[PDB]
Amino acid sequence: MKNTELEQLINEKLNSAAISDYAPNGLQVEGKETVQKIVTGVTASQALLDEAVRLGADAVIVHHGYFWKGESPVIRGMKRNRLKTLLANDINLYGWHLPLDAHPELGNNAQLAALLGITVMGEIEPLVPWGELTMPVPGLELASWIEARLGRKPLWCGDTGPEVVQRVAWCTGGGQSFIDSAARFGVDAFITGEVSEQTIHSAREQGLHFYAAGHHATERGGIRALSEWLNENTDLDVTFIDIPNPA
Template sequence: MNNLQLEKLLNEKLSPQLIKDYSPNGLQVEGATEINVVVTGVTASQALIDKAVELNADALLVHHGYFWKGEPEPIRGMKGKRIRTLIKNDINLFGYHLPLDIHPELGNNAELARLLEIEVEGGLEGHPQSVAMFGRLKQPLTGAQLAERINRALDRAPLHIAPDNADKLIETIGWCTGGGQDYIELAAQHGLDAFISGEISERTTYSARELDIHYFAAGHHATERYGIKALGEWLAAEHDLDVTFIDIDNLV
């Protein structure tokens, strides 16, 4: 498949034009014209690029790519090494950030809901491009039971901040993968029993206590493995590309 054809295909699937983002979505570093072998992963770190080189990949498809708003512009140091490695090995870099978070079938939020057995009901922000979601567990759980389910599903024990009534059952739940901790107030305004995000900030602890809501920090990387993996599996199944998902360990 031609690299520009692949970009068009991904854009048609993920509709990046519908959402404002902090980085460009699509083809970020141009490489080989013809693409047969694709490596997918969460972040375009040097370790992931090196694995793509090892697998003779023509393209690297990630959730966290490059050229973020506010970052230094010079291509030097760590950033320079990463981009030199891609160019030297003729590897295309495709990055999709918020469009992959919110996609209703393949997105990080949709995949987290599937893994945790949450029935999706809508977006916390009240529109289809909401990056935070809400829904309902099929059966109510205690905080400890939900923490154990998260641990089993993501292979990572979450940080759980319980409300004053620690035995309060969880039925309605909001979530936002990655750095979505500040949606906790919106979750509380919706009257939800619990909120899950990837990252936690110092302020989030006080928010959870004062809003009287179960809160779970499940890891930025851990909550965002599954969208890019699902996107790669879709490419392999529907478009006959050789796709390999590589999980580079990250404890945050």
């Protein structure tokens, strides 16, 4: 496929142009016009980029790319390293940030719900869907449940949460700032990827179970799902590569 057709194909599937973001979504670093083999991961790290080269990929797709608002434009250190590995090999780089968090089918938020057994019921705010566990459980068992489906032990704070958690709201990644709004809505538990010092008081003082289940662990779902979707809806050859990151 042509690098600019793939950009178009996914941009429309995710209704990407319509979403205001922190970074440019779509083709971020141009490469060869003709794409056939694609490598994908959560983040465009040096490690992911070296694999794309060893595997001979023509394009790489990530949920976290570069050119984030407010960062220095200069190309030195890490950025020179990464950009050279791409440019020198004519590898195309694509990144989809928020559109890839929110899409109803393929998004990180939707894939987490399905992975954790949550029936999605609505949305509190743009990136904060709510729903209920198809099998409500005490706060401790929910932590082991998360741990087991995600392959990572979450930080779990539930000193004052309800007996059983049924109603849950979540946001993958660094969504901890959304705990107060999920508390005002009324949930038994708020799930996200990272944690902050104030997030813990929000949990205790408002009576809900909090789970920080990993930034990387909660953000494999969307990019992974957009990979299967490209394998099923086109002839491109795409491979999702999970490169661990404990955060």
